[PDB]
Design a protein around this ligand. Sequence first.
Ligand SMILES: O=C(O)c1ccc(OCc2c(-c3c(Cl)cccc3C(F)(F)F)noc2-c2ccc[nH]2)cc1
Length: 242
Amino acid sequence: SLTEIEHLVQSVCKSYRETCQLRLEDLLRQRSNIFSREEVTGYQRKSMWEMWERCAHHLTEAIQYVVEFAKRLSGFMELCQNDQIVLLKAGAMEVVLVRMCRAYNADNRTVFFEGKYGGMELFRALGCSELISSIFDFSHSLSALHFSEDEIALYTALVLINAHRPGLQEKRKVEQLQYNLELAFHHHLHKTHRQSILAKLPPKGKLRSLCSQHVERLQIFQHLHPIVVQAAFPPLYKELFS
Ligand SMILES: O=C(O)c1ccc(OCc2c(-c3c(Cl)cccc3C(F)(F)F)noc2-c2ccc[nH]2)cc1
């Protein structure tokens, strides 16, 4: 069924298009729109907890778009609810991290944050310079691949649909989805003469370790200074918040 796989490609790309928050053309246009030194200093003088509140809410929104992305993946809703949650808890923040590279400019090492581009010194008040530097470096690595929009869509679908996640109840069912998405991805790379990115993608442990350091920091901030979340996915919220 060649058209089944082509239909999967089109359905993954559409779900991605509907949930990607900002258009790539917008991010690229805005690359010349850079925070002044005066604006940077304004961010640096903000309280750690106000920066935390801002960043925690951007990350919450980013997670919720990734959840909607997964819910629109063919067959995701047909998994048992325990499995949907296992997959989202393990991979939705990894997808957020991958998606960030779209908003990263490697020429000057800046990210699109709250309407303009700025460097990692924008986040000085958070006092997490090691984590921030790891996120920038990871985004720097990915930007070298010059990911197309469909590659990011297909790759991030696979970040989520991983039948090796511990705790899955219907592993065979997740495997079926995973095989079709892998075929979708590899077919698409072949059609576009882009199979060379396959050897350049992040080692799986790199993404896993960055996200576990990232989420652990968010849990520390959330314990010290909890933000209020507009919970759209009760079974998922319940696993992350306590
Ligand atoms: O709308 C909903 O129901 C909903 C449900 C779950 C949900 O989790 C968000 C989340 C967080 C996080 C964030 Cl982003 C901000 C502040 C504190 C945390 C904290 F660390 F405390 F959890 N970290 O990892 C995640 C995560 C989710 C899935 C994988 N990982 C956000 C929204």
